Structures are given as C-alpha cells and as structure tokens.
Amino acid sequence: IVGGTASVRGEWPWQVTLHTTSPTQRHLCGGSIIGNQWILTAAHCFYGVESPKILRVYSGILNQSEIKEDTSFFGVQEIIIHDQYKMAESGYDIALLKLETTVGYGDSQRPICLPSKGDRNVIYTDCWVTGWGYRKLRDKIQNTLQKAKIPLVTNEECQKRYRGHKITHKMICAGYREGGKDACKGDSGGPLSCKHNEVWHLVGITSWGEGCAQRERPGVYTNVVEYVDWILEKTQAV
Ligand SMILES: COC(=O)Nc1ccc2c(c1)NC(=O)CC/C=C/C[C@H](NC(=O)/C=C/c1cc(Cl)ccc1-n1cnnn1)c1nc-2c[nH]1
C-alpha cells in the first residue's frame, strides 16, 4: 500500500494473508473471508501455482511477524479460477479458495458482506484498500497491515486514464487524480472495502495498475457486484 497507515488489530477481520510454501514460505497475495470455508482473491495470484497443497491461509493477522512454523493456518482444498480468466488486464480476475477446514468466527476473523445487486446504483464514499504490499514500486512486503482511503472513479474517467486498455464494467477503479495513495506489489487479491449504512461491503478485489499511486493512474479492481452470481454458483453448489 502506498501512502497508507498502520491498521489497528481487528480493523479488517476479513483480510487474510495467503502464503506459498514453494520453494520457501513467503506472502503471495491478500484475500477476504466471505464464508466459513471461503476466501475471495485474485485469479492472477495463482500464476505458476500447480497445486493447492503449497498454499496456507492465515487469518487474524495484523503483523507478518505473528507467522512462524507453529502459527495455525487453513489448508486449501481447492483453487477455483473464473474460467473466462486470461490475465488481470483483461478482467475476470477472481478466484475462490475452498478451505480444508472451517473458520471459527470471532472478533479477529469474520466475513465481509458481498455487495447487493440492488446496490449496484449506490455511491460509495468511504472505501479503503488494505494489504502488506510494497509502499512504492521497489520495496518489500510490510510487517504491519496497511490501509489507505481511496475514492472510487467512474468507468468513463478510468477508461480515459487507461488508453490502450478496455476498462469494462466488470472492473472498478479507485484513486486520486494527483495520485499518492494506492495498492502496490503484494496487495493484489486483497479487498477494496466500502462502508455503507454502517455495513462493510466487498466492493473490489485489488487487481492491477500502471505503476503504483501515479497521478492519473487509478488502481483497477475486480468489480465484485458483477460476480455475485458466479460466487453463489461456486459456494452454494448442490
Ligand atoms: C517475501 O515475500 C514477498 O516478497 N512476496 C511477494 C512480493 C511481491 C509480490 C508477490 C509476493 N506476489 C506475487 O508475485 C504473486 C503473483 C502476483 C502478481 C501481481 C501482483 N500485483 C499486485 O500485488 C498489485 C498490483 C497493483 C494493483 C493496483 Cl490496484 C494498483 C497498482 C498495482 N501495481 C502496479 N505495479 N505494481 N503494483 C504482485 N505481487 C507481487 C508482485 N506483483
């Protein structure tokens, strides 16, 4: 996260840190708890991931230093990537992790509400991007979960900012015209959380941008409201 500040413990209890174990253990991506065996994240996170056996989901983490060999985690039973996904820049950048065991909800780990289809018209004015990602293009994973408040940008303005790309309505953009606050390397897969009527909603999934926090280059997020039926298809299968 660029231009962000340290989160407080329990502030983003749906935020997870997804680690890979191959070749050595390191943070891979962010994710959000959406159900008691379900993590919503970005499809591009699994580039070169040949098996869910190398994945570890850590919930209830503020500091990466809380993670050692004796720290509990959730194993991943299945990786579900949207089957129209090709690359982050073309959209469909969404994946589900089916966990091997159930998350016990509490004040340190609990789900974020998905957006309502009826609320595709609501204007979100209180949106935050969170993660342990870089603070600038050449940096390192941060110990403490960071947060940054960022305004949503219309599809029309985002398209003007990304000449040569096709910014679809399945993408949602967020950033200041002057830049300064954004997601960066290591934040992808994490949430873009917006508070509306005292309820937090998973509005976006951190996906891509041209550089980090650059002037007139908003961060591009998977527009979660456009995938609610796809999520229910995969999580509520009979
Ligand atoms: C010690 O542990 C580490 O160093 N881990 C460790 C360290 C680094 C990384 C990983 C693991 N994860 C991956 O490589 C998985 C595969 C993932 C690809 C892409 C992913 N992109 C982002 O996270 C965000 C991009 C992004 C998003 C928005 Cl909204 C705006 C601007 C963005 N940026 C443009 N340029 N940079 N950011 C990424 N993540 C990293 C590098 N790039």
Experimental method: X-ray
Range of the domain at 69: 13-111+227-238
Protein residue with least CA distance to atom 7, ligand 1 = 186
Nearest Cα neighbor of 152 from 119, 177, 184, 180 is 177
- Whether residue 35 sits in one domain with residue 138: no
52 secondary structure, DSSP code = G
Is the C-beta atom of 76 inside 6 A of ligand 1?
Answer: no
Q: Are strands 38-41 and 26-35 parallel, antiparallel or unpaired?
A: antiparallel
Say whether the peptide bond before residue 191 is cis (omega within 30 degrees of 0). no
Coil, strand, or helix at residue 54? helix
- Whether residue 199 sits in one domain with residue 149: yes
Cβ 2 vs Cβ 181: under 8 Å: yes
The CATH number of whichever domain residue 84 belongs to comes to 2.40.10.10
- Whether residue 143 sits in one domain with residue 31: no
Active site residues: 44, 93, 188
Instruction: Please list, in sequence order, all residues whose beta carbon lies within 8 angstroms of the beta carbon of residue 160, skipping any fewer than 6 positions away.
Output: none
Is the C-beta atom of 191 inside 6 A of ligand 1?
Answer: no
- Whether residue 141 sits in one domain with residue 29: no
Nearest Cα neighbor of 82 from 207, 209, 231 is 231
- Whether residue 116 sits in one domain with residue 71: no
For ligand 1, pick from 188, 216, 217 the residue to mutate: most ligand atoms within 8 Å of CB.
Answer: 188
- Whether residue 53 sits in one domain with residue 42: yes
- Whether residue 122 sits in one domain with residue 95: no
- Whether residue 21 sits in one domain with residue 107: yes
Q: Residue 7 is encoded by which pair of tokens?
A: 């989160």
Amino acid at the residue 176: Y
Cβ 169 vs Cβ 223: under 8 Å: yes
- Whether residue 36 sits in one domain with residue 84: yes
Is the C-beta atom of 135 inside 6 A of ligand 1?
Answer: no
